[PDB]
Short mmCIF file of C-alpha atoms and ligand atoms in Angstrom, two decimals:
data_model
loop_
_atom_site.label_atom_id
_atom_site.label_comp_id
_atom_site.label_asym_id
_atom_site.label_seq_id
_atom_site.Cartn_x
_atom_site.Cartn_y
_atom_site.Cartn_z
CA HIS A 42 90.09 84.14 79.78
CA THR A 43 92.20 86.01 82.37
CA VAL A 44 90.11 87.19 85.30
CA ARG A 45 91.47 90.45 86.73
CA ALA A 46 91.58 91.07 90.48
CA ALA A 47 93.17 93.31 92.98
CA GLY A 48 94.14 93.10 96.63
CA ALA A 49 95.86 94.83 99.45
CA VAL A 50 97.84 94.73 102.60
CA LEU A 51 95.61 96.99 104.65
CA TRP A 52 97.59 98.49 107.44
CA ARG A 53 97.29 101.02 110.19
CA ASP A 54 99.47 102.39 112.91
CA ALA A 55 100.43 100.19 115.90
CA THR A 67 104.72 99.51 114.76
CA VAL A 68 102.23 98.86 112.02
CA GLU A 69 99.49 96.27 112.09
CA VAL A 70 97.84 94.56 109.18
CA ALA A 71 94.48 93.04 108.51
CA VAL A 72 94.02 89.31 107.87
CA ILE A 73 90.62 88.03 107.01
CA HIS A 74 88.76 84.74 107.44
CA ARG A 75 86.51 83.34 104.69
CA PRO A 76 84.08 80.45 105.45
CA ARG A 77 83.95 79.44 101.80
CA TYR A 78 87.43 77.86 102.31
CA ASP A 79 87.92 78.27 106.03
CA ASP A 80 91.02 80.22 105.23
CA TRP A 81 93.01 83.22 106.37
CA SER A 82 94.19 85.57 103.60
CA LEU A 83 94.70 89.14 102.39
CA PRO A 84 91.64 90.98 101.09
CA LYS A 85 91.33 90.78 97.34
CA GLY A 86 88.56 90.58 94.80
CA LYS A 87 87.53 90.74 91.18
CA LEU A 88 87.21 93.80 88.98
CA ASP A 89 83.60 94.81 88.23
CA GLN A 90 82.79 96.07 84.70
CA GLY A 91 84.68 99.26 83.78
CA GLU A 92 86.87 99.13 86.89
CA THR A 93 90.70 99.53 87.00
CA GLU A 94 92.74 97.43 89.46
CA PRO A 95 93.24 100.30 91.94
CA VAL A 96 89.51 100.98 92.25
CA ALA A 97 88.72 97.22 92.54
CA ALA A 98 91.29 97.02 95.40
CA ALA A 99 89.82 99.93 97.32
CA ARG A 100 86.25 98.71 96.85
CA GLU A 101 87.15 95.11 97.73
CA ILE A 102 88.91 96.42 100.86
CA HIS A 103 85.82 98.36 102.04
CA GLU A 104 83.49 95.34 101.16
CA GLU A 105 85.64 92.75 102.86
CA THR A 106 86.92 94.71 105.85
CA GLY A 107 84.64 97.73 106.24
CA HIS A 108 87.59 100.17 106.09
CA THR A 109 88.20 103.07 103.78
CA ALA A 110 91.76 103.36 102.58
CA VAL A 111 94.19 105.16 100.28
CA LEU A 112 96.52 103.03 98.16
CA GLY A 113 100.25 103.63 98.05
CA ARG A 114 103.07 101.45 96.79
CA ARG A 115 102.37 98.47 94.61
CA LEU A 116 103.46 95.12 96.11
CA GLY A 117 103.45 92.75 93.15
CA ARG A 118 101.27 90.30 91.28
CA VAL A 119 99.89 86.75 91.93
CA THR A 120 98.68 84.51 89.10
CA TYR A 121 97.00 81.10 89.42
CA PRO A 122 94.85 78.74 87.43
CA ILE A 123 91.05 78.82 87.93
CA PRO A 124 88.32 76.89 86.07
CA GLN A 125 87.72 79.92 83.74
CA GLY A 126 91.45 80.14 82.99
CA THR A 127 93.77 82.31 84.99
CA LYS A 128 93.34 84.86 87.71
CA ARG A 129 95.78 87.71 87.91
CA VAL A 130 95.80 89.66 91.17
CA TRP A 131 97.74 92.90 91.77
CA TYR A 132 98.34 94.08 95.37
CA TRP A 133 98.88 97.45 96.94
CA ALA A 134 99.83 98.73 100.29
CA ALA A 135 96.72 100.49 101.67
CA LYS A 136 96.54 102.73 104.67
CA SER A 137 93.26 102.64 106.61
CA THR A 138 91.55 106.02 106.76
CA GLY A 139 88.96 104.63 109.13
CA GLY A 140 86.02 102.38 109.65
CA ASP A 141 85.13 99.19 111.43
CA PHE A 142 84.71 95.55 110.41
CA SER A 143 81.53 93.62 110.66
CA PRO A 144 80.81 90.08 109.52
CA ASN A 145 79.68 89.93 105.98
CA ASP A 146 78.77 87.42 103.26
CA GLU A 147 82.38 86.71 102.25
CA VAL A 148 84.33 87.47 105.42
CA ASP A 149 83.16 86.47 108.91
CA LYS A 150 86.21 87.55 110.89
CA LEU A 151 89.17 89.91 110.57
CA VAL A 152 92.25 90.17 112.89
CA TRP A 153 94.74 93.05 113.14
CA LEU A 154 98.27 91.70 113.57
CA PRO A 155 101.81 92.94 113.65
CA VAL A 156 103.65 91.74 110.66
CA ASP A 157 105.40 88.69 112.20
CA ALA A 158 102.14 87.40 113.58
CA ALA A 159 100.32 88.19 110.30
CA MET A 160 103.02 86.18 108.56
CA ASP A 161 102.04 83.13 110.66
CA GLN A 162 98.32 83.77 110.23
CA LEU A 163 98.43 83.85 106.41
CA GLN A 164 98.03 80.32 105.05
CA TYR A 165 98.95 81.03 101.38
CA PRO A 166 102.68 81.29 100.41
CA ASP A 167 101.68 83.85 97.81
CA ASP A 168 100.17 86.14 100.45
CA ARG A 169 103.26 85.76 102.59
CA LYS A 170 105.39 86.85 99.60
CA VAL A 171 103.19 89.87 99.19
CA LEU A 172 103.58 90.66 102.83
CA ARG A 173 107.38 90.32 102.63
CA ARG A 174 107.32 92.94 99.79
CA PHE A 175 105.29 95.20 102.11
CA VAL A 176 107.76 95.22 105.00
CA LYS A 177 110.82 95.63 102.85
CA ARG A 178 110.24 99.33 102.21
CA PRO A 179 108.48 102.13 104.07
CA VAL A 180 104.66 102.21 103.69
CA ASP A 181 103.70 105.58 105.13
CA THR A 182 104.27 107.23 101.74
CA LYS A 183 103.14 110.34 99.85
CA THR A 184 102.41 109.88 96.16
CA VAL A 185 103.27 111.79 93.00
CA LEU A 186 101.13 110.62 90.05
CA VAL A 187 102.72 111.19 86.60
CA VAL A 188 100.20 110.70 83.80
CA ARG A 189 100.71 110.64 80.05
CA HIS A 190 97.96 112.66 78.33
CA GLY A 191 95.19 110.70 76.60
CA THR A 192 94.78 109.93 72.93
CA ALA A 193 94.59 113.16 70.88
CA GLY A 194 94.62 112.17 67.19
CA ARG A 195 97.39 112.68 64.65
CA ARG A 196 100.40 115.07 64.79
CA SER A 197 100.27 117.90 62.25
CA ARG A 198 102.83 119.61 60.03
CA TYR A 199 102.70 122.99 61.82
CA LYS A 200 105.50 124.04 64.16
CA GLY A 201 104.87 124.36 67.86
CA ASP A 202 103.91 120.77 68.87
CA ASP A 203 100.12 121.29 68.24
CA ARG A 204 99.67 123.27 71.42
CA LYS A 205 95.88 123.36 70.86
CA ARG A 206 95.35 119.83 69.66
CA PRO A 207 92.53 118.29 71.79
CA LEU A 208 91.79 114.73 73.09
CA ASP A 209 89.78 112.61 70.73
CA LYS A 210 86.72 110.59 71.73
CA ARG A 211 88.75 107.70 73.19
CA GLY A 212 90.96 110.14 75.01
CA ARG A 213 88.04 111.98 76.66
CA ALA A 214 86.83 108.63 77.94
CA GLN A 215 90.32 107.82 79.24
CA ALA A 216 90.20 111.13 81.03
CA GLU A 217 86.84 110.27 82.64
CA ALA A 218 88.13 106.79 83.56
CA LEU A 219 91.19 108.23 85.28
CA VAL A 220 89.26 110.13 87.88
CA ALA A 221 88.40 107.13 90.10
CA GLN A 222 91.80 105.49 89.49
CA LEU A 223 93.70 108.58 90.55
CA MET A 224 91.32 109.24 93.46
CA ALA A 225 92.24 105.73 94.73
CA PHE A 226 95.78 107.18 95.55
CA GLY A 227 94.36 110.18 97.38
CA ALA A 228 95.22 112.69 94.62
CA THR A 229 94.88 116.25 96.03
CA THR A 230 96.57 118.85 93.72
CA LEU A 231 96.78 119.26 89.98
CA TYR A 232 99.55 120.05 87.47
CA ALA A 233 99.69 119.90 83.72
CA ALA A 234 102.25 120.70 81.03
CA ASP A 235 101.41 123.76 78.92
CA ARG A 236 99.60 121.81 76.24
CA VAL A 237 95.77 121.59 75.80
CA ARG A 238 95.70 117.77 75.66
CA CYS A 239 97.54 117.51 78.99
CA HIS A 240 95.00 119.78 80.73
CA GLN A 241 92.03 118.05 79.20
CA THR A 242 93.27 114.67 80.43
CA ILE A 243 92.95 115.82 84.09
CA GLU A 244 90.02 118.29 83.81
CA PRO A 245 87.51 115.58 84.77
CA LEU A 246 89.53 115.09 88.00
CA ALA A 247 89.66 118.85 88.46
CA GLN A 248 85.87 118.86 88.26
CA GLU A 249 85.62 116.05 90.77
CA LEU A 250 87.94 117.79 93.19
CA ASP A 251 86.68 121.21 92.17
CA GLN A 252 90.26 122.45 91.68
CA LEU A 253 92.42 124.51 89.40
CA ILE A 254 95.14 122.91 87.27
CA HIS A 255 98.54 124.58 87.57
CA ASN A 256 100.12 125.12 84.14
CA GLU A 257 103.68 123.85 83.62
CA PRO A 258 105.57 125.23 80.57
CA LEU A 259 108.82 123.63 81.81
CA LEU A 260 107.32 120.16 81.25
CA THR A 261 106.44 120.25 77.64
CA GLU A 262 108.64 118.16 75.34
CA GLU A 263 110.06 121.39 73.89
CA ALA A 264 111.05 122.70 77.32
CA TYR A 265 112.35 119.29 78.39
CA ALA A 266 114.77 119.00 75.47
CA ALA A 267 115.85 122.63 75.75
CA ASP A 268 116.45 122.42 79.49
CA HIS A 269 116.07 118.97 81.01
CA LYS A 270 117.62 120.07 84.23
CA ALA A 271 114.92 122.70 84.67
CA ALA A 272 112.28 119.96 84.36
CA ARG A 273 113.95 117.60 86.89
CA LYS A 274 114.29 120.47 89.31
CA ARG A 275 110.61 121.40 88.86
CA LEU A 276 109.40 117.80 89.22
CA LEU A 277 111.14 117.70 92.60
CA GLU A 278 109.65 121.03 93.69
CA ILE A 279 106.17 119.81 92.94
CA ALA A 280 106.78 116.49 94.71
CA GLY A 281 108.02 118.44 97.72
CA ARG A 282 104.83 120.38 98.13
CA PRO A 283 102.38 118.94 100.64
CA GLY A 284 99.62 116.83 99.15
CA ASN A 285 99.69 114.20 96.44
CA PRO A 286 100.24 115.90 93.10
CA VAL A 287 99.00 114.78 89.75
CA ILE A 288 101.34 115.87 86.92
CA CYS A 289 100.08 115.36 83.38
CA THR A 290 102.84 115.53 80.81
CA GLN A 291 103.99 114.08 77.38
CA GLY A 292 105.56 110.86 75.96
CA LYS A 293 109.16 112.22 75.54
CA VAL A 294 109.31 113.70 79.02
CA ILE A 295 108.18 110.69 81.09
CA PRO A 296 110.75 108.01 80.56
CA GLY A 297 113.56 110.60 80.87
CA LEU A 298 112.28 111.76 84.25
CA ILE A 299 111.24 108.40 85.70
CA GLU A 300 114.38 106.54 84.55
CA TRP A 301 116.59 109.29 85.93
CA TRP A 302 114.80 109.28 89.27
CA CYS A 303 114.73 105.47 89.52
CA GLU A 304 118.45 105.18 88.79
CA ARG A 305 119.45 107.82 91.36
CA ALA A 306 117.13 106.32 94.06
CA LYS A 307 117.93 102.70 93.12
CA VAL A 308 114.26 101.84 92.49
CA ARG A 309 113.28 98.95 90.38
CA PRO A 310 109.99 99.37 88.38
CA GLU A 311 108.23 96.07 88.24
CA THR A 312 106.52 96.99 84.95
CA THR A 313 107.31 99.68 82.42
CA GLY A 314 105.47 101.40 79.61
CA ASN A 315 104.49 104.79 78.36
CA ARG A 316 101.06 104.69 76.74
CA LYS A 317 98.75 107.62 76.35
CA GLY A 318 96.56 107.76 79.46
CA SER A 319 98.94 105.63 81.55
CA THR A 320 100.01 106.54 85.10
CA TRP A 321 103.30 106.24 86.94
CA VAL A 322 102.71 106.04 90.74
CA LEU A 323 105.75 107.43 92.46
CA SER A 324 105.90 106.68 96.13
CA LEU A 325 108.02 108.78 98.37
CA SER A 326 109.20 108.40 101.93
CA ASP A 327 110.99 111.38 103.62
CA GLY A 328 111.38 112.81 100.14
CA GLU A 329 113.07 109.63 98.78
CA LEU A 330 111.58 107.70 95.98
CA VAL A 331 110.75 104.16 97.21
CA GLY A 332 108.49 102.99 94.38
CA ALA A 333 107.61 103.47 90.71
CA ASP A 334 104.55 101.64 89.52
CA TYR A 335 103.42 101.67 85.92
CA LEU A 336 99.64 101.41 85.37
CA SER A 337 98.09 100.71 81.95
CA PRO A 338 95.64 103.17 80.30
CA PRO A 339 92.22 102.54 81.93
CA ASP A 340 90.83 101.07 78.70
CA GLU A 341 93.68 98.71 77.77
MG1 LIG B 1 85.25 90.47 97.91
MG1 LIG B 2 87.49 88.40 97.85
MG1 LIG B 3 83.97 91.13 94.57
#
């Protein structure tokens, strides 16, 4: 059995300070992390565990790596994110009796686990006050047909509609604010549950279908950057053949290493930007994988 968990470096502005917590169970000082509840994805687990353990609300940004260790049940895998506090206040709780805010150097000395210190070294290495473009592959939508036109009207199937529902919370954990979808029904349907949650329109993007991408790949790159440049954190739902071409191109020009890679239906690429430069590309599994 692998137990899945998520954690964060919770930070706020002064130049940045980060939260270290004390737990009486081990008398230790560590970074907030906890286990995924039923039906949760790692990003939601992180944000919930942060608010439970520290009393702060926060929006996740860049991913900061993974920690794996044995436990009596088997293995625990923990993924960490940088998380900006959006407010709140600590008070002693069941799991955590104290919390200190520390500049990074001091936090480095406070943290007793080498693995947390590694995570914190990832954190300081790149900017953390980032905006976030969220590139999503549309959910499962059955079989491809014989008819020309790339099944423009083909809808999500039952699993795909569920992936769409599951994505709402996951994408909300990155402070998603505006919505974009390639001119295919399945792409829109994948983010319509989020649109409902945010009560917002989805902007249609004919330049980001597979057809348009192959016919004019430069138009798509140029449009991806326009969207990214707009204020807010855009969600862009597109197709399998478009995603690798765009992400790989952007990672190579920015010199960004993706720690994981994939391209499954319902998966998300979290693209973190600082001053309009890509500083991160984080591949997340479909919510039901
Ligand atoms: Mg906890
Ligand atoms: Mg915990
Ligand atoms: Mg917990």
